[PDB]
Amino acid sequence: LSCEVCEAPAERMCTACTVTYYCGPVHQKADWDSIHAKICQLLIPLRTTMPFYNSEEERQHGLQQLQRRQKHLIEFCYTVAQKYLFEGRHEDAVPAALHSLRFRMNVHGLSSVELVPAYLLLAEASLGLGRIVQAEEYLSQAQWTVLKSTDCSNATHSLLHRNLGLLYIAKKNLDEARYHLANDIYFASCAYGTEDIRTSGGYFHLANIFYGLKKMELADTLYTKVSEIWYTYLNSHYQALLEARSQQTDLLGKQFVNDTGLDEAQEAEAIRILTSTLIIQESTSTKAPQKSILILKTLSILYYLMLECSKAKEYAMKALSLAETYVSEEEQRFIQELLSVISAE
């Protein structure tokens, strides 16, 4: 046996669960935070070896429900890992990712494409740790898998190319960074369509390269494309919510749920993208403050749909003050309406 979380020794028991194994206090603490704050005990129902399911239907039922629970927690762990990578908590990401990988090994087997998402998260954490060659290990595995893969979807391959690009981005060739992110953007565009937030994430990394190249007009163009995507999606939700709340009233009445419809990890990535986009859009070209107003609107909408009320208010107030000098009344009246909705809700 080993410390499953790192394959160092099982130096200590997981007193929370007995089933988890730690190389003493540092990984004990980090894995406690990472998986046990999220679910802790639920792994115990996974870890327990079954008693005899006595008939074919009992075996089938027990396997099906165990496996589907395993899958559900596999995906929740992978979402948690993604959020820890977006939150920068790469230490906490390392347990969550390694667990999700090992459970994918157990259900799917090492050969599966389903590991490729986890392998790429383990690259991403390694690059958060600067362990470039370690990330190259898991990208190597993924690359062989996908090159063999009989069925790799457009989204899956977009993931591969995106992380390949990120790995070279830690490397030193901007040409490769563009080449691979471009492939990611293509495969996102054909899977999702051209206005998806994930495509925009590709465009964002491309913009950051064009900013590093100081190719201000192309970088700003990419930042515009991304900002417009985020705007359009959040507008789609915000408009639909207000329109439905307006549309009709029986005497029963109703109230609709204020909702981002996002993954919390997608919300964290939205904040990371929009914030970096705003700062780079200003520093490349303060000559277009209206694009800052657009990003402030975008974030204020996101914050309202979250009910991140404090930043929703602050960023709406900023947008309104800038829009009064810079922009037509439509901008100001939208931002006033959004503030009135935040303050009422």
Binding site: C6, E7, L110, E137, Y138, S140, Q141, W144
Partner: protein, 44 residues
């Protein structure tokens, strides 16, 4: 006329030996893929 059939057979065998060389290259690349599989082992 038989000479033409013989020479067409000989050049056919030349293409056989070319492809057999490529089969040895494929055997090499199979051993390479197994080497990369051993890199999969993912100790940490």
């Amino acid at each position: 006329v038989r000479w033409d059939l013989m020479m067409k057979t000989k050049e056919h065998t030349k293409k056989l030996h070319q492809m057999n060389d490529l089969c040895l290259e494929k055997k090499k690349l199979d051993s390479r893929l197994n080497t990369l599989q051993n890199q999969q082992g993912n100790a940490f």
